[PDB]
Amino acid sequence: GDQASWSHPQFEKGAHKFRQLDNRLDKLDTRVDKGLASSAALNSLFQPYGVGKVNFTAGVGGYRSSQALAIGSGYRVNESVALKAGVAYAGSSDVMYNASFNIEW
Amino acid sequence: GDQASWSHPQFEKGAHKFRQLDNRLDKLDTRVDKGLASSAALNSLFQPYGVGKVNFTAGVGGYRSSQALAIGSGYRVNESVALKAGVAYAGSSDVMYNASFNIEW
Amino acid sequence: GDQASWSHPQFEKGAHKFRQLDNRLDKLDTRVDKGLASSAALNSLFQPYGVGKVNFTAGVGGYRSSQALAIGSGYRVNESVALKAGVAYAGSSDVMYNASFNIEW
């Protein structure tokens, strides 16, 4: 039983199975921790005004116990239609890209 | 050992256990990939102005290697109080709903 | 086989291994459900205007089949530079913090 809490070794091949599963779960949670932190940072922008010019959006964020840096840019044309798109950098292999559009009803 | 990398079969019933766990993990990660993509797309809006009318917010996004479509709408009354709410459609069984409010301090 | 669907018990110690893994997966998905709901709620704000004052941002959200409450606040100085930062409360042990900045290009 390894030390006490873990206790991966179970059978002739249960130790490798338990370790593999435990490693996969930790990897999923990690991607969500950093992935959410970066995504939020990007979704935390909104471009300050924009009657017909370009605006730079960027910022950092954090989730649970992780941190990520997100960036982006969009062009705010007129006061009726809009558009925003940027990329977020989380951890190492956790990258995401956004692209939405705002409109007045 | 299946092919080489996988190697699900372990014992008399380890093959089914390893496959079930591997399938569950992949399903969790998937929901996060599309779920985050859609959520972000919705959170990437902000409604262009709004002194006392309605605004339509919609857009698409992507995370890691997935894509989702999000939509929403809110009424921007006055220049002090606000409100935004919309729904996001990710994958197939990945739907989320938002509803927040902005205020000037 | 427990009841039918579950069927955790497999070997002399497979029941405990299957239960532990199944419990971990459910815990990961949970953190993502509430974590995404709260994060979105916070990222669903944008501060209504701000030429040189403070703005309070807060709201709730939901993902899949969960609900969370998020809050935050930032100071909107001038009509070129900006900043937003807040904290989101999800479930019980699912807390996140954001902090980004907007700028006109």
For residue A95, give Cα distances in angstroms to A5, A25, B20. 34, 19, 28
* Contact list, B48 vs chain A (CB under 8 Å): 50, 76, 79-82, 102-104
Residues B58, B45 contacting (CB under 8 angstroms): yes
Q: Is B43 left (phi over 0), alpha (psi -120 to 50) or beta?
A: alpha
Strand partners, B73: B56, B85
**What is the set of domains in chain C, with CATH numbers?**
1-105 (3.30.1300.30)
Q: Which residue of B has its CA nearest to C11?
A: B13
By residue count, chain C amounts to 105
Q: Is C22 on the interface with B (CB under 8 A)?
A: yes
Strand partners, A96: A88, B63
Technique that determined the structure: NMR
Of A18, A54, A61, nearest to C100 by CB-CB distance is A61
- For chain A, how big is the Rg over CA atoms in Å? 21
The type of residue at B75 is Y
Q: Is A4 exposed, middle or buried (0-12, 13-18, 19+ CB in 10 A)?
A: exposed
The one-character DSSP state at B72 is E
Report which of A72, B27, B67 is spatially closest to residue C32, judged by C-alpha positions.
Answer: B27
Flag if B46 and A102 touch (Cβ within 8 Å).
yes
| DSSP structure string for chain C | --SSS-----SSSHHHHHHHHHHHHHHHHHHHHHHHHHHHHHHT---S--SEEEEEEEEEEEETTEEEEEEEEEEEESSSB--EEEEEEETTTEEEEEEEEEEE-
Residues A104, A76 contacting (CB under 8 angstroms): no
